[PDB]
Symmetry: C2
Subunit: 532 residues, 2 copies
C-alpha cells in the first residue's frame, strides 16, 4: 500500500489527502523521540523506542506546551499562530507529505517553525506542506521541538537541565530523516532545512554546531539568523533566568538539584504563567528561554565561529521582510494600536527606542535616536512610527542577518539573498504594519494557489515563483533553472553583495541591503557600548 511505510522505528500508516483537485500521501504525527515527560522534563531527548504493529499517522499530533497569545481574542491575524491542537509535553513528532505516486529518491525539505523559541506548532494551517510537496514534487517534512522553559531552561553544569534541549529535539528529528526518509521516497543526501524567525536562527545554529552539520545538505533562513540579539544568552544569564523562574514559583534555590526537582513537580501552565517575569530588562523582541552558548552545542562564541569559518560550508538561501518590527511594537510599545494609524509622538518615539535596545546606555540610546530621526520634521507622527518600525527590524532581524551572510559568504559555496516586500492583499492586520514578520511564509507554502483563500492572480504567480525558487535551490543549490529564459536571481558575492526583491513586480536586483543602518548596528553601536 502507498500509505504503508516500514521504517527503522516500525511501520507507519499514512492517509491520502486532497490537494488542488489531486492527491498526495500524508504521514502525520510520527514520533521521533521518547515523550520528554516527568523526570525527563528539561533533559536531552532520547530516541523513540521501536514499536511493533502499525503506527496510525493519519492525524496531527499534539503541540508542545506554550504561552498562548490572547491579546486579540477571535482575531484571525493572531490566532493563526496559536496552537491548533491540544497542548501536551508529549509533543515530539514529525509530519511528512509525500507525492503520489511515491518517489524513489527525491529532494527533501525539512521545515523548522519559528515563534521566538517560546511558541510555535508544526500543525498550523500556514505550514500545511501538501501544496509545496504536490506542486514542486518534493518530500516535505515538518518537525517539532520543545519551546519555552521546557526546551531551553539552562542550568549549565548539570545534566538534568543543560539547556539547548529544544535544539537537540530538532537534531533528533533531522537524525530520523537522515536514517528513514529513504523509505518515503526521499533522498537523505539531499535534504534542505528551512525555517522562519527562531526557526531561521535554528537553521543557522545547525550550520554552526559540529553535531548537526552532517545531517543536512543545504539551508534556507527566513527572517532569522543564529547571531540575532534575541536568539541566545550566556550560560550566566541562562542560569540567572532559571533561578528567577524558580523564585517566581517559590522553589528551593539551595542547589540545582533542588531547583530542578521543584520545577519538575509543577504543571506546565504554572511555568508558563510566570515565564515572562524573568527578562532582565523592560523590552520588546526579547524572549525568556532561548539557546545558550554552552561550549558543547556551540564550541565557542558565535562571532569567533563565524570569523574562523568554523561551520558547515554549503549553499544557503536567505532573506528578510520589509517591516520585521511592526508586530513587536503593536504588542509592546506605547502609542501603537491595532485599530489606529499609530502616529507616534516624540515622547513615545524615545520611549520605544529604550524598549528596542534595552542593553544600551544613555549615549547608545542617543546614537540610535539620532540615526533614525529626521530633524527637519521631528514631530511627524508617521516618520516616528516608521522610524521605530525600522529600528526594531534592523536591530533584531535585518542587520544581524546581513552580518551572518557577509561572514558566511567568505567561506561558503554559494549565497542567494532576497528582500520580501509584498504586502498580501488579504491581510487582516492594519496598513501601518506593512510587510509583516512571518507573512512571506504563506507564499512559501503556497496558500495563494487555493482560490477560497482570496489572493489575487499576481499573488498566486508570486507564490509559484517562490515555491519554485525554494525547491529548485533545495534540489540543485541554485534557485534558478539552468537554461531558463526567466529573470536570473544573481549570486550574492563578497564583492557585489547583490540581492533581489520578492514581489509581484518584474525582478529588480539591488546591492548592499540596508548597508547604512547595518554598519551602524554591526560596527559602530557595539563599539560605542563597549567603550562607554
Amino acid at each position: 500500500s502507498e500509505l504503508l511505510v516500514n521504517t527503522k522505528s516500525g511501520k507507519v500508516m499514512g492517509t491520502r489527502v486532497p490537494v488542488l483537485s489531486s492527491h498526495i500521501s500524508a504521514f502525520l504525527g510520527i514520533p521521533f523521540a521518547e515523550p520528554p515527560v516527568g523526570n525527563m522534563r528539561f533533559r536531552r531527548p532520547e530516541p523513540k523506542k521501536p514499536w511493533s504493529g502499525v503506527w496510525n499517522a493519519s492525524t496531527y499530533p499534539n503541540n508542545c506546551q506554550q504561552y498562548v497569545d490572547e491579546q486579540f481574542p477571535g482575531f484571525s491575524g493572531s490566532e493563526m499562530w496559536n496552537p491548533n491542537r491540544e497542548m501536551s509535553e508529549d509533543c515530539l513528532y514529525l509530519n511528512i507529505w509525500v507525492p503520489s505516486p511515491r518517489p524513489k529518491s527525491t529532494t527533501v525539505m525539512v521545515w523548522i517553525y519559528g515563534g521566538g523559541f517560546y511558541s510555535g506548532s508544526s500543525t498550523l494551517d500556514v505550514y500545511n506542506g501538501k501544496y509545496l510537496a504536490y506542486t514542486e514534487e518534493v518530500v516535505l517534512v515538518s518537525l517539532s521541538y520543545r519551546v519555552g522553559a521546557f526546551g531551553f531552561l539552562a542550568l549549565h553544569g548539570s545534566q538534568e537541565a543543560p539547556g539547548n534541549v529544544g535544539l537537540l529535539d530538532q537534531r533528533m528529528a533531522l537524525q530520523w530523516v537522515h536514517d528513514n526518509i529513504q523509505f518515503f521516497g526521499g533522498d537523505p543526501k539531499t535534504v534542505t532545512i528551512f525555517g522562519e524567525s527562531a526557526g531561521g536562527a535554528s537553521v543557522g545554529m545547525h550550520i554552526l554546531s559540529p553535531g548537526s552539520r552532517d545531517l543536512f545538505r543545504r539551508a534556507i533562513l527566513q527572517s532569522g539568523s543564529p547571531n540575532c540579539p534575541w536568539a541566545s544568552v550566556s550560560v550566566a544569564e541562562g542560569r540567572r533566568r532559571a533561578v528567577e523562574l524558580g523564585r517566581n514559583l517559590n522553589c528551593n534555590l539551595n542547589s540545582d538539584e533542588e531547583l530542578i526537582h521543584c520545577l519538575r513537580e509543577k504543571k506546565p501552565q504554572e511555568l508558563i504563567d510566570v515565564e515572562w517575569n524573568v527578562l532582565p530588562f523592560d523590552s520588546i523582541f526579547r524572549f525568556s528561554f532561548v539557546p545558550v552558548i554552552d561550549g558543547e552545542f556551540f564550541p565557542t562564541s558565535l562571532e569567533s565561529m563565524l570569523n574562523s569559518g568554523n561551520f558547515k560550508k554549503t549553499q544557503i538561501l536567505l532573506g528578510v521582510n520589509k517591516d520585521e518590527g511592526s508586530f513587536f511594537l503593536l504588542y509592546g510599545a506605547p502609542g501603537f494600536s491595532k485599530d489606529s494609524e499609530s502616529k507616534i509622538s516624540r515622547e513615545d518615539f524615545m520611549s520605544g527606542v529604550k524598549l528596542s535596545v534595552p542593553h544600551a546606555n544613555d549615549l547608545g540610546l542617543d546614537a540610535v535616536t539620532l540615526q533614525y530621526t529626521d530633524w527637519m520634521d521631528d514631530n511627524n507622527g508617521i516618520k516616528n512610527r516608521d522610524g521605530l518600525d525600522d529600528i526594531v527590524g534592523d536591530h533584531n532581524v535585518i542587520c544581524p542577518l546581513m552580518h551572518f551572510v557577509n561572514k558566511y559568504t567568505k567561506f561558503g559555496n554559494g549565497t542567494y539573498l532576497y528582500f520580501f516586500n509584498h504586502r498580501a492583499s488579504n491581510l487582516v492586520w492594519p496598513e501601518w504594519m506593512g510587510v509583516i514578520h512571518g507573512y512571506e511564509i504563506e507564499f512559501v507554502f503556497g496558500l495563494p494557489l487555493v482560490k477560497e483563500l482570496n489572493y489575487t492572480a499576481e499573488e498566486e504567480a508570486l507564490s509559484r515563483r517562490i515555491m519554485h525558487y525554494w525547491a529548485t535551490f533545495a534540489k540543485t543549490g541554485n534557485p534558478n533553472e539552468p537554461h531558463s529564459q526567466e529573470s536570473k536571481w544573481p549570486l550574492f558575492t563578497t564583492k557585489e553583495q547583490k540581492f533581489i526583491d520578492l514581489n509581484t513586480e518584474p525582478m529588480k536586483v539591488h546591492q548592499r541591503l540596508r548597508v547604512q543602518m547595518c554598519v551602524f548596528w554591526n560596527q559602530f553601536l557595539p563599539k560605542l557600548l563597549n567603550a562607554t
Copy 2:
C-alpha cells in the same frame, strides 16, 4: 574744508577719492592707539596721545606683523589676502570713508577683518569701503588689531602679556569711533560692527564681553561666531603654547618675566617663523594664538554666558557660505590639489577626518566618518571630497554659528539668517572648492559694481541687494525696506528658524539650516567625547 576734520585726538586731513564716476572723502591711517612696540609688545593698548597740527590721513597705514602665505606665489586667489602694505608692529590705525557732501548724523558701519587671528589687513582691495559708503550713504570704518603672538600671546596672571590684547585693540578702535565719529558725520548711537571669520568671531566676542557692549548698536557676523572651536583656548592651553613658543626660540623659561623679556628682544619675523610649531595636534583650521577665556574680557565660559543671556541684547544679522571648508583642505589635507579635481580615496578621507577633528578619540573619529559616509558608494572620489569639505565647514563654521544663533535668539531683539551659495563667475580657485570661505566679502563691499573687475550683471545686482540689506539693517535693525514690494527676508525665530539663500535666483526661504549635522556636532559628538 570737507577733507579737514577736528577730532578729540587732533586735526586730520583726508583725501578725495573717485568712486563709480563720483567722489567721496577718505581718511586713511588715523592712529587710535600708541604704537605697541618695544616694552609695549604683548601689552594692552594705550590711547593715542593727542597731537598738534594736522594728521595727514591720505594714505593707507602699515599692516600688523603677520605670517604671509606663499603657498601659491603670484596667484591672485591667495595673494589678495596677503598684506599689501609694509608690515610693522606700529599698525594700530583705522580708516574712514565719508559720503560727500559730509553727512550730519548718518549710520556707521565698522568692519573687523578676519584671518584666523593670525593674519589680516584693513587695507586689502576687497575691503575698500568707498563703494559701500558711496552707494548706501553710510560712514564706513575699518579698524586694525594685532594678530598672532603679538595680539594673543597669553600668560594669564601677568600684566605684561595677559592675552586678548588684540581684542582690546578692536575695542579701543570702537571707543574712538564712539567718541569721534560725530565729527565725520556719523551717528555714534547707530554703529554696526561687522566682520568675517575671525572678524565675525570677534563681533560675537564684543557682544559677549561686558566692556565692549556699550560701544555699538547692532552687529553682523559673517562665517564666524565666538564659540567656534578654533576661536579661543583655555588659560592653561594659552600658557602652554606661550611657553612652547619660547622653547622654539631658546628662551629662558624659569619665569613669565624671563620668557616675556626674551620674547620682546626678538625681531617680529623670528616669532612668526616658529608660530605654527606650538599647535597641540596635527590639524586643519586650528591657529596658534587666539583669544583666551580669561575671566576678565570673558566673565565665564562662553557656553554659560550664552545660556544665561549674559550678553548684549540687540538685533543681529549673520550667516555662512556653502563651502566654508575647501580652503583649509586645499592647504593641509592629503589628496587635495589646486590644479586637480581632488577626488579623495577612502584612505585620505579618514586621514582628513583625523585632521579635521584633532581632539577626537577613536570612537569619535568613527562617529564622524559614519555620519558623512554613503556606504552604498564609499569609494566615490567626489563624494569623499565633498563629504570632507562638509565636515570641515560644519564643524568649524556652520554648526557653531547655528548653536550661537539659537542661543542668542532666545534673548535677542531680532535675528536675520542667510546662506550664501553663489559661486562668483570670475573665481580663480578651482571648481571643486565651490562657494569659498571669504568670497561673499566682495559682494558685501560691492566690487561687482566695477565693470573692470569682470562680474556679470546678475552678480552686480546681487551685490546691490546685499549691500542694501546690510546697510538697511545697520540703520534700522531690519534688512528689509518698510513698504517695499520686494521679497521679504523673514525674521529667524526660535520656533520657525527661517533663513534665506543669498544668490542670483529669486529669494527662497528655508528652515533649520543643516539641522541634521548640527545636532550631531552640537549635541551628540560632544556628549560622546565626554563620556568616552
